[PDB]
Amino acid sequence: EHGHSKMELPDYKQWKIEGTPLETVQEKLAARGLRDPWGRNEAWRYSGGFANNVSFVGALLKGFKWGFAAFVVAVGAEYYLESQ
Amino acid sequence: MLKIIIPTTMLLPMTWMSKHNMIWINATVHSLLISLISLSLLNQLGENSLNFSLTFFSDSLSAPLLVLTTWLLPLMLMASQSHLSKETTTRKKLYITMLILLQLFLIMTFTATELILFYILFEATLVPTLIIITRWGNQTERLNAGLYFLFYTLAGSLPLLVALVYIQNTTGSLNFLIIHYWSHPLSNSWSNIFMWLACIMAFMVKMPLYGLHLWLPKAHVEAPIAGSMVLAAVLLKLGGYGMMRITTILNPLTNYMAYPFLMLSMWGMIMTSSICLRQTDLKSLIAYSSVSHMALVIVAIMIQTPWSFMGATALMIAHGLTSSMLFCLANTNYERVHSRTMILARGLQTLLPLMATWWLVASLTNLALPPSINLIGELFIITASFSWSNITIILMGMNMMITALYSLYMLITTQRGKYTHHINNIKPSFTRENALMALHILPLLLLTLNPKMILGPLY
Amino acid sequence: HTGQEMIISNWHWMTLQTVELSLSFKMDYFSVMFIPVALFVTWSIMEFSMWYMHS
Amino acid sequence: SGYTPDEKLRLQQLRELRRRWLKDQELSPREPVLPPRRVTYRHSIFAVTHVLIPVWIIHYYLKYHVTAKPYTVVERKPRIFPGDTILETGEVIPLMKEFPDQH
Amino acid sequence: AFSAPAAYLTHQQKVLRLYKRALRHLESWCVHRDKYRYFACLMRARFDEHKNEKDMVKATQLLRQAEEEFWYGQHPQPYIFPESPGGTSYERYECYKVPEWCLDDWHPSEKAMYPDYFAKREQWKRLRRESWEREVKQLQEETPPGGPRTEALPPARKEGDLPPLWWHIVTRPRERPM
Amino acid sequence: GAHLARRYLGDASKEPDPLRMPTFPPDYGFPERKEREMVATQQEMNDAQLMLQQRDYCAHYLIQLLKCKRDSFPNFLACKHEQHDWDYCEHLDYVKRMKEFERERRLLQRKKRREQREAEMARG
Amino acid sequence: GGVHIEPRYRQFPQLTRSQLIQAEFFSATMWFWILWRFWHDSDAVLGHFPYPDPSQWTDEELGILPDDED
Amino acid sequence: SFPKYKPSRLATLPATLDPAEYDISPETRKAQAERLAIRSRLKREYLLQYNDPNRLGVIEDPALIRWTYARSANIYPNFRPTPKTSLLGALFGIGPLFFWYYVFKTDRDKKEKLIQEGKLDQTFNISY
Amino acid sequence: SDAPPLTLEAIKDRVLYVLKLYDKIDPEKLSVNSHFMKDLGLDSLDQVEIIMAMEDEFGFEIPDIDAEKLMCPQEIVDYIADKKDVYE
Ligand SMILES: CCCCCCCCCCCCCCCCC[C@@H](O)O[C@H](CO[C@H](O)CCCCCCCCCCCCCCC)COP(=O)(O)OCC[N+](C)(C)C
Ligand SMILES: CCCCCCCCCCCC(=O)SCCNC(=O)CCNC(=O)[C@H](O)C(C)(C)COP(=O)(O)O
After folding, report:
1. Can I43 be counted among the known catalytic residues?
2. Domain I8-84 class in CATH
3. Which residue positions does the secretion signal occupy (chain F) (predicted)?
């Protein structure tokens, strides 16, 4: 069993520089009379599920919300059990 | 002791009256049976010895060497079967006759209650080996090698003979038992110094000592496979056996006289180990490794302590087996490639995997991996040397490091990497060759289960 | 629970005059603590290898 | 730059030869022609053959051969604390000196 | 690799090699894609400034300062593709590569399995046996006297011809034999 | 740390050498000079076979801690009070060592002040 | 061993919900454990016993005489 | 300008920093052409012998034979006793022996003097 | 590994994709056999950039001696297929 499903490529016209740091690169290059030719070859790295980013502290706090909720529930349960 | 000597003599009429196509089978079967018979001399005593008669006696130094000598002949026959296939029947029978004569001389040499009888047989071994090297060797240098191998030996052996007869004129006997029981101190005199040198140099040249080791790479590179096997396994150990036997009458002069030989050995082991690192020939590399191991054995015998003697015995047996295996592996490569150059045939692990396993095991045992008997002897000698002087540990550790280095270098150069493209005649390894390697290696790993059998009379 | 400590000298290998060599195992705190950890790590590593070295 | 016409033609011929060879490397449906000839449960049998039998052998060997000799298995002499009683003798270890206890 | 080398590299070959090497080391320094794009456009603008230069002595004085600058700022740990001569899997699969002649030494019981494969194998062997005797003559007649000057081989020029010395190129083991 | 800075960058004789402490008689300060109290005896403290470096004036609390750890084995959170007691006794021991260091330092200070006062009186 | 997931070629890879839920569960478990241990045993990090001030000890309890007695 | 790279024995000069490659003259180009011609002739001979379907063995290499023979058997006939050779031989073959002899002799003399004086403390030293 | 067995068609589409994302070429004038220097009016530096784009897109790098003589998309596809042992 292997992956023989006839994968097709997306549309090359989809990749655009707008809304990406490549746009800033192109704008900065234009101030010197230059232009970036391979920009759209790099656009897919900022387009889909790769568009949203997380910070370092956000990465370290990957599951702090659920753990904190469980901690509060547990400490409340212990408080209501010991005080009996 | 005749129960071993007579069957060895009967090997000759059985060989010469055999059929043209039955010589190898019969010789191998009866040599294996003789080995089985000789295996019952390992039952030694903590008392004196097994004094069979006035002429022959057995010792726990003699018995392991005798068993190894008997066990080596069948392996030599198996190894010689291949390259002697296109040979006439008479000349094959003559080759087998040389092998049988060499075994008989070695067996009588190792028992030999007399020092003159020991000398006579010790030198009688010189003739069949010389014929084997100069007759069935491939290269044009074999003759030269034989010359070296001869004269070196005699250069040391004629003075010994003189000293020997001189001793009997003063002591009245050369029997090992009377010599040991009636030993008297040797005064620090010029006459006694030269008597000491005459007694030692004959066995020193055969180890070989580092200064006098030039004949050995020549003889091993030039000799056929069986010649190399017997030279590396048994003939080098004659010097160690003789030194252990004869140093009993050389005290206390050994304390002063041993210094030059100790320095030569401790530095030449480093020298020959480093030589092994830059060697373009497998046989030459294995010969230099043998020189290093025998340098360690010389140090052990010169230190002359119980642990030294135990380690020397263990190392002699272990090196005999390991070096014979290494020569056999190199010869299996040579019979395919016809070059004997290490760099030529490469990446053989991909083409011959089981033979690569044999190479790995042989390299590991040459490297002295515990708890192999190679390391048992190495460690006992090293501890004795440390007690002798704590600074020897530097040279011993350097020797261990360099030994590991060239052993794994030899393994990696031949077995690892990419195969040579233009070599296409590499056939699958034969059952004969695999069985030869197994019959070398299983006895070593069995001996590590019962080390006291090879630790000598001081155990 | 109790702190049980042992030495197990089971097989006597060669004896060298006054020196005796034997197959002996020390089962102190270090051994009985490190063996389970190493076994657990090796178990995880082998399970990982059946996926990593499949080809 | 680029390929010379001879280089192009040689590459084309070598390419078609190589592709033929590679296609020929494929196996037919019958290719591994194998000649046959003969002369909870899984974990249960694994535990019996790989744990129970070795532990039986080792326990027998330790209990009846190794401990036949002296000093082969040496224990620790377990700790004794005040207030304990010993199974062998039955006597009680005296307590402490009732030190001043606070906090 | 496949193409034969020449006696020397021309000036424009050296310039293009420096261009490729400098951009690779620049992207090694510039990890992120947009930063690399910006600095690569700057590097290209710096290269094409002297693009139309006609003084070859001055052009060779250039490219020398350029290679000295490259060696000064060359990123001592550049990125290498894993299978490239410095990569982490450069010769990883060479131990799985076995020559095609080894199959000649298989036991008949081994060749009994895979009969179609071996039949195609003798087909290939017959092809080689005829083509070779033709190829030796073709190479002999095509080679200038005094020996070859460049290690390039001719194509097949007739109809039934095969390219000379084709066997060990066509029957390469594989990139990933196992 | 501050004492290291004072000793290595200031006057060395101002503060003690930790290897040679103490350099003054015990009863030099006050004559009451009570001696330390030891609760665990020789034999019981040997039978517990604690360690040679664990055999200090805190030994009995360690005996009780070990006694709990043995008795309530599966509940390895059972005895926490005796852990606190042993820690507190060790804390008191360290505080006493700190007081010894401070006392020796102040005695050195006062001795140097007496020496300089004697020098000033001699010069006067 | 697992499920079949096809390559994607310049788009975000296909994600199973099982791996997301397990990763989130284990991250939350670690954070809950840290919070629980800090709540129950905070003196292993902050310390429990005060550190005394050497200068706060009077000469009376430290055995010092007013520079003339001895 | 940038800091200079200085080559060494174990860190050689890079190819792209050689003044030689940038000094192109017709004799240099001719030398390169002849070098390539020699290499191509050798390659042609090797591949002709390599692709041969009738060849069933090692392709013997005269260069390898020359290398091994020069390394092993051509040394002594080309040896000449020279001040450099004599001094290096004497040093490297005698000096270490006497150095080690002095070291070990001094060590054992100190040990022997200590054991005669009785201040060696050889307790529990049973195995030697 | 679990690497799909890429085919000649996949290599061709990926090469043409990478070329169509290069804005110096208008995609409707591009073709499989279109020469880089003359049919597309590109400089040698552009060819070096295209070779590096192919290297970064296929995960392996082409030696300069081979790379400098790849002037068509079909040539690049052929070289990649021969390197990767592609059957069909
Ligand atoms: C070449 C490859 C290796 C071959 C084997 C080499 C090993 C052989 C080395 C020989 C061992 C040493 C020989 C004699 C040792 C005795 C110690 C003596 O030589 O040293 C001093 C002796 O002083 C001088 O050395 C006198 C001898 C000087 C003449 C010898 C020549 C020196 C260099 C020659 C070396 C050549 C060796 C090879 C010859 C072919 C000691 O002072 P002294 O207290 O008074 O004598 C005590 C001994 N007594 C009581 C018996 C008298
Ligand atoms: C981070 C690492 C540090 C790297 C720093 C390296 C220094 C960068 C600056 C390099 C300086 C130069 O331009 S070096 C100047 C060398 N001389 C010339 O360029 C003269 C003629 N130019 C050519 O012939 C070219 O090949 C060309 C026409 C461009 C293409 O040709 P195609 O038509 O065949 O594509």
Report:
1. yes
2. mainly alpha
3. none
